Structure 1
Amino acid sequence: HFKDPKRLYCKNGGFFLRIHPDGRVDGVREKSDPHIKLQLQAEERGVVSIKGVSANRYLAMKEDGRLLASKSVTDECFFFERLESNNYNTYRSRKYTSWYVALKRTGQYKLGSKTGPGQKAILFLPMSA
């Protein structure tokens, strides 16, 4: 159900995207983590803002490609939610069009400036929560 929060499981390591109440962004494999329940909201067709339910912050991509969770919505809080042909989702910055929300094999976000299409880090699988 699209109305409920979703958990984003990254194909690269099995890390769930996490948004800390303090605005930090990273990953964690622990499904019971309190800060991994996200509320994906569509702003328009194919565009979503990712809100951390616990942290009450919005995932944002910065000009240099670093992630963080803003307190209020800005124009860096929108992404192109696309269900790829491999059946995994990808979240591309609507503002920095060539960069993806992605996590490294180590559990840390990967810089937009370093993400590409052939990368396992940019692939996520939505999981109802």
Structure 2
Amino acid sequence: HHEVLLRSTETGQYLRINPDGTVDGTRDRSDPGIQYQISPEGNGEVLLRSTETGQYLRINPDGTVDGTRDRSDPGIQYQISPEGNGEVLLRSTETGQYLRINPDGTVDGTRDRSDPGIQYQISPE
């Protein structure tokens, strides 16, 4: 299905959207909530849709991260920005916040371009 995994370059943790719409990080490569489809929006924007539950990764204005079913719900548009050597940043267009996965497996938004938790590998399933 051309699914991809979104993996922290820092810790190797995978971004997971859970059936309850919560989002966190896990090392469990077998978890069904870590597969995504990149949804082209055009103009350099994409949505990141969890395949198991059809939810889009959302970064909320308050800096919290969760999932949503509704593609018009803002906060779900991203710019995938290559850094080099196959590492990328995932920048939410609405607010300009980067998607951050922290070493403890919590996931939130940040503007700190230097934070080690905003770098990802995107790999084919």
User: Separation in 2 of the partners of 1:102 and 1:47?
Assistant: 18
Of all paired residues, the percent bearing the same amino acid is: 26
Q: Is the 8 Å Cα contact of residues 48 and 78 (structure 1) preserved in structure 2?
A: yes
Aligned residues: 124
Q: Give the 3-state SS of the residue equivalent to 1:4 in structure 2.
A: coil
- Where does structure 1 lack aligned partners over 5 or more consecutive residues? none
User: Separation in 2 of the partners of 1:20 and 1:41?
Assistant: 19
TM-score by structure 1 length?
A: 0.89
Which residue in 1 is equivalent to 2:89? 90
Which residue in 1 is equivalent to 2:22? 24
Which residue in 1 is equivalent to 2:5? 7
User: Separation in 1 of the partners of 2:26 and 2:111?
Assistant: 19
Q: How far has the Cα of 1:12 moved from its partner?
A: 2.3
Match of 2:65 among 59, 64, 67: 67
Q: Is the 8 Å Cα contact of residues 13 and 107 (structure 1) preserved in structure 2?
A: no
Flag the structure with higher strand content.
Answer: 2
User: Separation in 2 of the partners of 1:80 and 1:48?
Assistant: 7
- Where does structure 2 lack aligned partners over 5 or more consecutive residues? none
Q: Give the 3-state SS of the residue equivalent to 1:102 in structure 2.
A: strand
Which residue in 2 is equivalent to 1:77? 76
Which residue in 1 is equivalent to 2:116? 120
Q: Which amino acid aligns with 1:77?
A: I
Q: Give the 3-state SS of the residue equivalent to 2:117 in structure 1.
A: helix
Q: Give the 3-state SS of the residue equivalent to 1:26 in structure 2.
A: strand
Q: Give the 3-state SS of the residue equivalent to 1:8 in structure 2.
A: strand
Q: Is the 8 Å Cα contact of residues 22 and 55 (structure 1) preserved in structure 2?
A: no
Q: Could you list the runs of 4 or more consecutive aligned residues of structure 1 that deviate by over 3 angstroms after TM superposition?
A: none
Q: Give the 3-state SS of the residue equivalent to 1:32 in structure 2.
A: coil
Q: How far has the Cα of 1:45 moved from its partner?
A: 3.7
Q: How far has the Cα of 1:27 moved from its partner?
A: 0.7
Q: Which amino acid aligns with 1:72?
A: D
